[PDB]
């Protein structure tokens, strides 16, 4: 049969331009240059990689296989991004 692990790719294009523009409006921005939408996807991918890497380090120390919400809360607290409301 066909190979294991159906692979996913270029999912950053799911952070679409209207979504980036809603986030800009909540940040209080009135007019958006058209080259912002790629700089923003770069910034987001870097942030997410840095957090998920630590969440997985925590989840591997505990010898398990699912990333819990405490792994994310600890990975965030370790970078100064404390988060209230998910079981801290």
């Amino acid at each position: 049969a066909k190979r294991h692990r159906k692979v996913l790719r270029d999912n950053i294009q799911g952070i679409t331009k209207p979504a980036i523009r809603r986030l800009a409006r909540r940040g209080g921005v009135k007019r958006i240059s058209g080259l912002i939408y790629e700089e923003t996807r770069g910034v987001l991918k870097v942030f997410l990689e840095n957090v998920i890497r630590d969440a997985v380090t925590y989840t591997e120390h505990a010898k398990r296989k699912t990333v819990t919400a405490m792994d994310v809360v600890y990975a965030l607290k370790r970078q100064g991004r404390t988060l209230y409301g998910f079981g801290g």
Binding site: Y84, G85, F86, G87, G88
Partner: protein, 95 residues
């Protein structure tokens, strides 16, 4: 038939029924208040631990807690916080 998992929910609720006797709290906001209390607990207790290692003592006392509060909290919160703690410890020893 689960294990017992404890929290500050009932003490947060007792304090709320004193400040605002006719207000309630949603479950998601009780989660936030619960993580807030743990966060400030660990900040103060870790600062007091450090403060006692510096001086080569091996006891966390009510002086370490007072000094850690004065180091961590901002200007006008810290005054009222130490005046609450002092009143509590006094009412305790005179009993």
């Amino acid at each position: 038939r689960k294990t017992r998992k404890e929290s500050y929910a009932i003490y947060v609720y007792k304090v709320l029924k004193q400040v605002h006797p006719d207000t309630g709290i949603s479950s998601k906001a009780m989660s936030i208040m619960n993580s807030f209390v743990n966060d400030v607990f660990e900040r103060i207790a870790g600062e007091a631990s450090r403060l006692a290692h510096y001086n080569k003592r091996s006891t966390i006392t009510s002086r370490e807690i007072q000094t850690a509060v004065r180091l961590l909290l901002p200007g006008e919160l810290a005054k009222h916080a130490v005046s609450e703690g002092t009143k509590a410890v006094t009412c305790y020893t005179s009993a």
